[PDB]
Write an enzyme that holds these catalytic residues in place. Sequence first.
Site, PDB file in Angstrom:
ATOM      1  N   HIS A 176     -32.104  -3.758  76.606  1.00 55.52           N
ATOM      2  CA  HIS A 176     -32.641  -2.483  77.068  1.00 55.52           C
ATOM      3  C   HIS A 176     -33.425  -1.742  75.994  1.00 55.52           C
ATOM      4  O   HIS A 176     -34.108  -0.765  76.316  1.00 55.52           O
ATOM      5  CB  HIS A 176     -31.509  -1.591  77.586  1.00 55.52           C
ATOM      6  CG  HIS A 176     -30.505  -1.215  76.542  1.00 55.52           C
ATOM      7  ND1 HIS A 176     -29.248  -1.777  76.480  1.00 55.52           N
ATOM      8  CD2 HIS A 176     -30.570  -0.327  75.522  1.00 55.52           C
ATOM      9  CE1 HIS A 176     -28.583  -1.252  75.467  1.00 55.52           C
ATOM     10  NE2 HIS A 176     -29.364  -0.372  74.866  1.00 55.52           N
TER      11      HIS A 176
ATOM     12  N   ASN B 207     -30.344   5.852  54.878  1.00 53.80           N
ATOM     13  CA  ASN B 207     -30.445   7.150  55.528  1.00 53.80           C
ATOM     14  C   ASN B 207     -31.652   7.140  56.452  1.00 53.80           C
ATOM     15  O   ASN B 207     -32.690   6.560  56.121  1.00 53.80           O
ATOM     16  CB  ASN B 207     -30.563   8.287  54.506  1.00 53.80           C
ATOM     17  CG  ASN B 207     -30.514   9.658  55.153  1.00 53.80           C
ATOM     18  OD1 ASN B 207     -31.534  10.186  55.593  1.00 53.80           O
ATOM     19  ND2 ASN B 207     -29.322  10.240  55.214  1.00 53.80           N
TER      20      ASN B 207
ATOM     21  N   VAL C  31     -33.829  10.225  54.677  1.00 55.59           N
ATOM     22  CA  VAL C  31     -33.961  10.201  53.225  1.00 55.59           C
ATOM     23  C   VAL C  31     -34.261   8.775  52.785  1.00 55.59           C
ATOM     24  O   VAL C  31     -33.538   7.839  53.147  1.00 55.59           O
ATOM     25  CB  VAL C  31     -32.691  10.732  52.540  1.00 55.59           C
ATOM     26  CG1 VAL C  31     -32.850  10.702  51.028  1.00 55.59           C
ATOM     27  CG2 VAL C  31     -32.377  12.140  53.022  1.00 55.59           C
TER      28      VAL C  31
ATOM     29  N   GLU D 285     -35.021   0.550  50.948  1.00 58.52           N
ATOM     30  CA  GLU D 285     -35.233   0.193  52.342  1.00 58.52           C
ATOM     31  C   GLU D 285     -36.499  -0.641  52.478  1.00 58.52           C
ATOM     32  O   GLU D 285     -37.473  -0.445  51.746  1.00 58.52           O
ATOM     33  CB  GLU D 285     -35.337   1.444  53.226  1.00 58.52           C
ATOM     34  CG  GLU D 285     -34.126   2.360  53.155  1.00 58.52           C
ATOM     35  CD  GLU D 285     -34.287   3.607  54.003  1.00 58.52           C
ATOM     36  OE1 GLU D 285     -35.371   3.789  54.594  1.00 58.52           O
ATOM     37  OE2 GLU D 285     -33.329   4.404  54.079  1.00 58.52           O
TER      38      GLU D 285
ATOM     39  N   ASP E  60     -27.246  -8.348  78.186  1.00 56.82           N
ATOM     40  CA  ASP E  60     -27.960  -7.323  77.426  1.00 56.82           C
ATOM     41  C   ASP E  60     -28.076  -7.782  75.975  1.00 56.82           C
ATOM     42  O   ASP E  60     -27.335  -7.356  75.085  1.00 56.82           O
ATOM     43  CB  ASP E  60     -27.249  -5.981  77.540  1.00 56.82           C
ATOM     44  CG  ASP E  60     -28.077  -4.832  77.001  1.00 56.82           C
ATOM     45  OD1 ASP E  60     -29.255  -5.054  76.650  1.00 56.82           O
ATOM     46  OD2 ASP E  60     -27.549  -3.703  76.931  1.00 56.82           O
TER      47      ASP E  60
ATOM     48  N   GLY F 295     -21.929   4.653  71.495  1.00 54.00           N
ATOM     49  CA  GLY F 295     -23.043   3.795  71.841  1.00 54.00           C
ATOM     50  C   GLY F 295     -23.757   3.188  70.652  1.00 54.00           C
ATOM     51  O   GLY F 295     -23.319   2.169  70.109  1.00 54.00           O
TER      52      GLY F 295
ATOM     53  N   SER G 208     -26.459   1.724  70.975  1.00 48.96           N
ATOM     54  CA  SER G 208     -27.348   0.802  71.683  1.00 48.96           C
ATOM     55  C   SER G 208     -27.735  -0.395  70.812  1.00 48.96           C
ATOM     56  O   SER G 208     -28.899  -0.597  70.460  1.00 48.96           O
ATOM     57  CB  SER G 208     -28.591   1.540  72.194  1.00 48.96           C
ATOM     58  OG  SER G 208     -28.233   2.577  73.091  1.00 48.96           O
ATOM     59  N   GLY G 209     -26.731  -1.195  70.467  1.00 50.56           N
ATOM     60  CA  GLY G 209     -26.981  -2.424  69.743  1.00 50.56           C
ATOM     61  C   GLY G 209     -26.348  -2.492  68.369  1.00 50.56           C
ATOM     62  O   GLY G 209     -26.850  -3.192  67.485  1.00 50.56           O
TER      63      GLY G 209
END
Lengths: 235, 232, 603
Positions: free
Chosen positions: B48, B62, B65, B70, B92, B183, B185-186
């Site tokens: 989804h 973060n 931040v 990253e 899903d 949640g 979502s993943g």
Amino acid sequence: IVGGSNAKEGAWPWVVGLYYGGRLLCGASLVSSDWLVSAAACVYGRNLEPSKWTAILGLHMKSNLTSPQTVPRLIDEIVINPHYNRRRKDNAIAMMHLEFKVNYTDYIQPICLPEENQVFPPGRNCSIAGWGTVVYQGTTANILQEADVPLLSNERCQQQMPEYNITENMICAGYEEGGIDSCQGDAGGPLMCQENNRWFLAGVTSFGYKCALPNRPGVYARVSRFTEWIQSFLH
Amino acid sequence: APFDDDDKIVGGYNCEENSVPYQVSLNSGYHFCGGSLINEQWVVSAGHCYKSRIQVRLGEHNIEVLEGNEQFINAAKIIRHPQYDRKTLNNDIMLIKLSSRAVINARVSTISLPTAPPATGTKCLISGWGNTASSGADYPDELQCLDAPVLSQAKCEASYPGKITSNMFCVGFLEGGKDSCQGDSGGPVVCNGQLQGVVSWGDGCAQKNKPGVYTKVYNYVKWIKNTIAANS
Amino acid sequence: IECLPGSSPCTDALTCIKADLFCDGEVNCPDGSDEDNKMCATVCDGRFLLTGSSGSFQATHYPKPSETSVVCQWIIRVNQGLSIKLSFDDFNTYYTDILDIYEGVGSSKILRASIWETNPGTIRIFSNQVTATFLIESDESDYVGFNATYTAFNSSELNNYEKINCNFEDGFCFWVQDLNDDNEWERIQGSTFSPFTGPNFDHTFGNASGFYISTPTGPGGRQERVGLLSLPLDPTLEPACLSFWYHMYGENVHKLSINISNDQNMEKTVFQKEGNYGDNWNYGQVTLNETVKFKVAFNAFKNKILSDIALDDISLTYGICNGSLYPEPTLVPTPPPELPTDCGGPFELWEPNTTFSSTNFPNSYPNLAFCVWILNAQKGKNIQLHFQEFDLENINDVVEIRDGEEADSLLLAVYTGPGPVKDVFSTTNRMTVLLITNDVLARGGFKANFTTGYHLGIPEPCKADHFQCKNGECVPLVNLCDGHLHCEDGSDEADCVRFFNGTTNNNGLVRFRIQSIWHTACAENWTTQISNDVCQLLGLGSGNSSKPIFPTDGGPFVKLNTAPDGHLILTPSQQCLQDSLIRLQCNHKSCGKKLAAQDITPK
Ligand SMILES: *[C@@H]1O[C@H](CO)[C@@H](O[C@@H]2O[C@H](CO)[C@@H](O[C@@H]3O[C@H](CO)[C@@H](O)[C@H](O[C@H]4O[C@H](CO)[C@@H](O)[C@H](O)[C@@H]4O)[C@@H]3O)[C@H](O)[C@H]2NC(C)=O)[C@H](O)[C@H]1NC(C)=O
Ligand SMILES: *[C@@H]1O[C@H](CO)[C@@H](O[C@@H]2O[C@H](CO)[C@@H](O[C@@H]3O[C@H](CO[C@H]4O[C@H](CO)[C@@H](O)[C@H](O)[C@@H]4O)[C@@H](O)[C@H](O)[C@@H]3O)[C@H](O)[C@H]2NC(C)=O)[C@H](O)[C@H]1NC(C)=O
Ligand SMILES: *[C@@H]1O[C@H](CO)[C@@H](O[C@@H]2O[C@H](CO)[C@@H](O[C@@H]3O[C@H](CO[C@H]4O[C@H](CO)[C@@H](O)[C@H](O)[C@@H]4O)[C@@H](O)[C@H](O)[C@@H]3O)[C@H](O)[C@H]2NC(C)=O)[C@H](O)[C@H]1NC(C)=O
Ligand SMILES: *[C@@H]1O[C@H](CO)[C@@H](O[C@@H]2O[C@H](CO)[C@@H](O[C@@H]3O[C@H](CO)[C@@H](O)[C@H](O)[C@@H]3O)[C@H](O)[C@H]2NC(C)=O)[C@H](O)[C@H]1NC(C)=O
Ligand SMILES: *[C@@H]1O[C@H](CO)[C@@H](O[C@@H]2O[C@H](CO)[C@@H](O[C@@H]3O[C@H](CO)[C@@H](O)[C@H](O)[C@@H]3O)[C@H](O)[C@H]2NC(C)=O)[C@H](O)[C@H]1NC(C)=O
Ligand SMILES: *[C@@H]1O[C@H](CO)[C@@H](O[C@@H]2O[C@H](CO)[C@@H](O[C@@H]3O[C@H](CO)[C@@H](O)[C@H](O)[C@@H]3O)[C@H](O)[C@H]2NC(C)=O)[C@H](O)[C@H]1NC(C)=O
Ligand SMILES: *[C@@H]1O[C@H](CO)[C@@H](O[C@@H]2O[C@H](CO)[C@@H](O[C@@H]3O[C@H](CO)[C@@H](O)[C@H](O)[C@@H]3O)[C@H](O)[C@H]2NC(C)=O)[C@H](O)[C@H]1NC(C)=O
Ligand SMILES: *[C@@H]1O[C@H](CO)[C@@H](O[C@@H]2O[C@H](CO)[C@@H](O[C@@H]3O[C@H](CO)[C@@H](O)[C@H](O)[C@@H]3O)[C@H](O)[C@H]2NC(C)=O)[C@H](O)[C@H]1NC(C)=O
Ligand SMILES: *[C@@H]1O[C@H](CO)[C@@H](O[C@@H]2O[C@H](CO)[C@@H](O[C@@H]3O[C@H](CO)[C@@H](O)[C@H](O)[C@@H]3O)[C@H](O)[C@H]2NC(C)=O)[C@H](O)[C@H]1NC(C)=O
Ligand SMILES: *[C@@H]1O[C@H](CO)[C@@H](O[C@@H]2O[C@H](CO[C@@H]3O[C@H](CO)[C@@H](O)[C@H](O)[C@@H]3O)[C@@H](O)[C@H](O)[C@H]2NC(C)=O)[C@H](O)[C@H]1NC(C)=O
Ligand SMILES: *[C@@H]1O[C@H](CO)[C@@H](O[C@@H]2O[C@H](CO)[C@@H](O)[C@H](O)[C@H]2NC(C)=O)[C@H](O)[C@H]1NC(C)=O
Ligand SMILES: *[C@@H]1O[C@H](CO)[C@@H](O[C@@H]2O[C@H](CO)[C@@H](O)[C@H](O)[C@H]2NC(C)=O)[C@H](O)[C@H]1NC(C)=O
Ligand SMILES: *[C@@H]1O[C@H](CO)[C@@H](O)[C@H](O)[C@H]1NC(C)=O
Ligand SMILES: *[C@@H]1O[C@H](CO)[C@@H](O)[C@H](O)[C@H]1NC(C)=O
Ligand SMILES: *[C@@H]1O[C@H](CO)[C@@H](O)[C@H](O)[C@H]1NC(C)=O
Ligand SMILES: *[C@@H]1O[C@H](CO)[C@@H](O)[C@H](O)[C@H]1NC(C)=O
């Protein structure tokens, strides 16, 4: 938390970090070759399994646990002061026993306990240590921070924070304009005062109301009256 | 201002999930879905979460931040499961391919695929950028990790009748009106050091009963191996 | 003529313009070749400009499924003041395919619609220029192609009925999405994401085969405002009634409002509902005023995830609104926070009452509970808790056991987490059991035993005047300060050397105890080894020599014998005369003296 600064290597040999489950949850101080002194509030509810507590001695950076000067150790026995309440936040000092022992070195040294009838006068600048944050919440610093803050008398401390009992079992340190504090975020070390030419375990990091806020004193656990209790377990 | 959690207590949450290099996030201007880093050029996420433009963040500490730890690699191709029932959110799971190869370091690394199905009571870890606030309609930026064992099939089916299928299993336990896995979502579902599932949905923000329903990824061995092999 | 990167030359190669300007609808080249159909070879159909009233177009790979990513753009131009309606029968694709309808041409376009994998239905653009951008973002075999049928219409002669009435089957009808909103409304067939939030079926059609509009269903985490605008309504001589169906289901539903706006700037709100109203379609009834031209809007505020609000079946009629047969909607009951405070429950119990559940141990314990159990026993009897079953959360739920009978209670043990726990022994005849609970993940609880007796945790003392250590091992004489490890506690090896009448803490006279009697020592000869041994016995640091003052004591002095291994040998034989008191002097252990050259930061 605001007020932190850079810490030189070996500046605070008696400051150690406590890891529970792989994260730095609290701090402690090295007093003897097999015992540590830490806050009882931050170790409450986790004393049944001392094996999950990781004691890092000589730690300097959060993500640099590779220097030979740092000797990790485990904890086998955890003792909490029987006078702790968890409701009034009184006497939040607990001791943790090391696995076997630790060899004294330049970057790992003990800290002298306050003697009998030894009280540091209020208003004297003392150093603080811990792996706190720059902002009030979040953004944990990977470098140990140090700051100087004079002691605050309990007579004004009980009035500036009319929410607790304070009494004579706590030592307050802070500023009228704020800016320097260590109560929240992460303890990561005790309150240290130096007289003559040597530091002492004047206080242990304790609860607080707000960080870097005016008229918000930082509470620290008093160690002068708890010297006998610590010395009973040191030997 | 007083808070429920104070006195150098982090609430039991990891410090931005230290030593967790398999955590990745999907960005389309804001954090909307998470996932796991299967390999240097593949990630696993819920079906989804499909969007026209998705930016993959690797080793994020973060959401707002940036400290230079990253990695930002734009998505090149997204493949979704060809049997997706949006009414029940079955199957899903989907795969997103990074345009450029990831750099493996202390904050970004791959995770081994599962080899055996999980069992009831297995110790598992749930990762995600969930809420960690006792009260207040605010979204914190802290990174939340919780431990929850896989429950029995009968209890999981009875918790949400008519929605639980053979490809779904419950990780959350009991109930509670405060913050939980909820949640994200993943969010990664890593049990015994190996990934086992992907967050699909749940009964709101852990309003009652199980905090959420998780989609098993062990059953899709073919869809997780042959698809990657043919889409190299 | 050379052009900078990101820009392309014209056909005449005389002026450099932005690459996006080509085939965009804005004439920038001096010769006007940027809008040429042949130059904008999309390969989809060989045509780029559709100046006719009506027509259609095809996409790449008409006879066979597409296998290569091709970008196609189409622009349709009609007479000024006329609008173009786009109608679609059935559209499918391989996920990554967006038609990208935009308002107008050139750099003034923002967005009109974006539909993928589903049939858009009918899309109406209230402008003389309509632009589309065919895109392929996958290398797999996508759909064969895309087509669109359009017809020109005046769009200003429409009456109120056509403008207002919309059952959401022919697209959005004539409603215009607001351009000053955080996000746009989404028309999705059937149920959507966020289970237990949003409609599972369409109101007009009755099942999932219908189409309805709602707030975006993406798993976002930010507050957004969505809005829908309508065409101005012509004045009427009779009051009109506005009817619509709204479905506000979700725990985070913020607010739904209409906020009618008129050309007189006298905007007012005629409808406003807040909170969850259950998974049922509610009827909204609105009376009309403001004969002057005005626009009907639907301003909905979208909260974080699980805050979906849907609208369907918009219709208009005339006359005063009839009595609403459908009952006025009511909010959900909501789990009531009935002041958890402190349940309390049982407080004190005596010997007859031993077995007891915590609060509701067979099922669970309430949240935010601070239960106090006062275990009172007879005088001289200790209390053993002897936990039977114990199942708490982990680190949050904690059972605290203290010692009573005094204001300053002494903590005995703290138990938490699953699994059995050890027994607790109280110092006096009173034990306090404290249960601290949290608001989340309340387990079944715990059960106690309440065992009382004499010397429950005190081992039997040794006989024949034999000393006993903490572990209970019998130590008559073997390990009386002799330097052994008979008991792991170490109480049998207590310090038998201490100061007496000294000047400071690290000062005193000789006082050595062999078994149970303290006595002085003989130090006629003093060296560094004996001083180091005394320091080690006293637990101090490095020391040095000392000298006596005057022989003021002539009692049973005991000579000190040193060993090369550092052990001190005590010989109870006073084979000496004129014994003198000896002062013991040593220094403390090396403490945390600063060594790093710390700088100075006057900030
Ligand atoms: C329909 O939508 C329009 C546009 O979104 C909206 O207009 C805005 O309304 C708000 C509040 O109704 C206005 O904000 C006000 O600004 C004034 C001046 O800065 C402040 O004094 C207001 O504070 C008080 O307002 C009320 C008194 O009028 C008090 O009851 C209230 O408690 C506050 O103390 C308030 O902040 C905003 O300026 C307009 N925007 C415009 C006019 O562009 C309108 O409210 C919506 N609803 C309708 C028309 O029914
Ligand atoms: C606008 O919304 C109204 C709802 O409040 C609808 O009803 C009426 O609308 C008018 C104007 O919008 C309001 O203003 C008043 O109107 C009266 C009408 O007076 C009539 O009676 C007197 C005495 O017999 C006569 O002399 C006049 O010629 C009229 O025949 C005025 O007298 C007032 O001063 C005031 O302006 C009404 O209050 C309002 N309610 C009622 C019960 O009338 C209105 O239908 C809406 N407009 C539309 C739909 O176009
Ligand atoms: C621990 O176990 C105890 C077992 O002995 C439980 O005691 C029970 O207590 C209830 C409530 O008090 C009793 O139910 C009633 O008790 C009244 C008491 O009368 C009082 O007033 C009269 C006035 O003349 C006085 O004479 C009495 O001495 C009392 O002071 C009785 O009058 C009723 O008939 C009725 O029995 C139970 O009888 C009593 N026993 C049992 C076996 O239930 C005690 O409640 C337990 N602890 C807790 C916290 O529940
Ligand atoms: C921490 O301190 C302890 C106590 O001093 C150290 O143990 C001692 O280490 C030395 C040097 O390794 C040992 O001396 C050598 O021992 C070996 C047998 O292992 C022997 O063959 C050599 O001839 C030499 O004597 C010593 O025995 C050992 N124990 C004691 C009681 O002194 C330990 O090494 C220190 N650890 C660190 C990391 O510094
Ligand atoms: C204990 O710590 C406090 C700070 O927390 C010390 O107060 C500081 O005192 C110095 C004076 O040596 C102040 O410096 C002054 O700065 C102004 C700036 O223009 C300058 O004009 C003066 O000539 C002087 O250099 C400093 O501002 C002040 N700190 C604060 C926050 O006001 C205090 O001296 C320390 N006491 C001991 C005994 O260490
Ligand atoms: C699309 O339909 C609209 C009708 O809503 C057309 O607008 C109308 O155009 C006529 C011209 O044939 C206007 O009539 C004229 O109005 C002016 C006042 O502005 C007056 O002075 C003239 O004597 C004449 O009556 C009419 O006002 C205008 N508006 C309406 C509501 O009827 C529009 O022209 C059409 N567009 C096309 C066919 O491209
Ligand atoms: C409110 O309810 C009415 C009734 O369902 C809706 O329509 C009404 O339909 C009747 C039938 O054509 C119209 O004529 C009326 O018939 C009755 C019975 O024969 C007669 O007694 C009346 O004198 C009248 O001739 C009627 O005008 C029409 N409207 C009303 C208000 O009754 C109506 O659409 C519903 N909605 C609104 C906003 O009125
Ligand atoms: C804590 O509570 C449990 C039950 O709630 C107590 O367990 C029971 O202890 C009694 C003895 O005090 C047992 O009776 C004896 O059992 C042995 C066999 O183990 C039998 O040989 C003797 O003749 C006598 O019947 C009883 O069976 C046992 N019940 C269970 C279910 O274990 C326990 O004693 C309590 N702890 C205390 C009082 O310290
Ligand atoms: C030898 O043991 C005795 C036991 O206390 C101590 O001797 C005398 O200690 C006083 C301390 O109040 C010394 O006074 C000062 O000592 C410092 C060094 O700590 C020195 O720098 C000053 O100039 C001043 O003398 C005194 O000197 C010292 N006398 C002797 C003969 O030692 C002391 O703990 C031990 N002495 C040494 C040198 O370690
Ligand atoms: C789901 O919703 C759809 C919406 O269209 C429902 O469709 C209704 O279909 C009936 C069927 O009547 C006839 O069906 C013939 C085919 O067997 C067809 O050739 C003929 O022209 C006629 O349509 C129709 O009467 C209704 O009007 C349709 N509904 C609407 C709103 O128009 C369908 O029944 C619903 N249920 C299922 C299970 O699909
Ligand atoms: C800390 O708590 C004690 C609790 O005893 C407070 O003592 C109070 O002292 C006043 C002065 O006589 C009495 O009137 C109260 O009755 C006492 N409290 C109680 C509960 O009996 C003490 O004041 C508190 N300290 C502070 C700084 O608030
Ligand atoms: C107590 O403070 C003094 C401050 O002078 C410390 O340092 C002494 O400084 C003098 C300078 O005249 C030296 O001659 C001494 O050797 C220094 N040490 C001593 C022990 O005298 C002194 O060190 C402090 N006390 C401690 C713990 O050493
Ligand atoms: C950090 O670790 C590296 C390991 O190579 C070491 O060389 C360096 O001295 C360390 N720095 C500190 C401040 O501990
Ligand atoms: C696009 O092509 C499909 C398949 O031929 C067709 O059903 C659809 O009508 C076409 N587009 C429009 C405007 O309907
Ligand atoms: C304490 O002082 C008395 C006074 O005579 C002395 O006799 C005694 O020996 C002193 N202390 C010790 C350690 O004996
Ligand atoms: C000091 O006197 C004691 C007393 O017995 C004796 O044992 C020891 O050997 C003497 N030390 C010498 C002679 O160096």
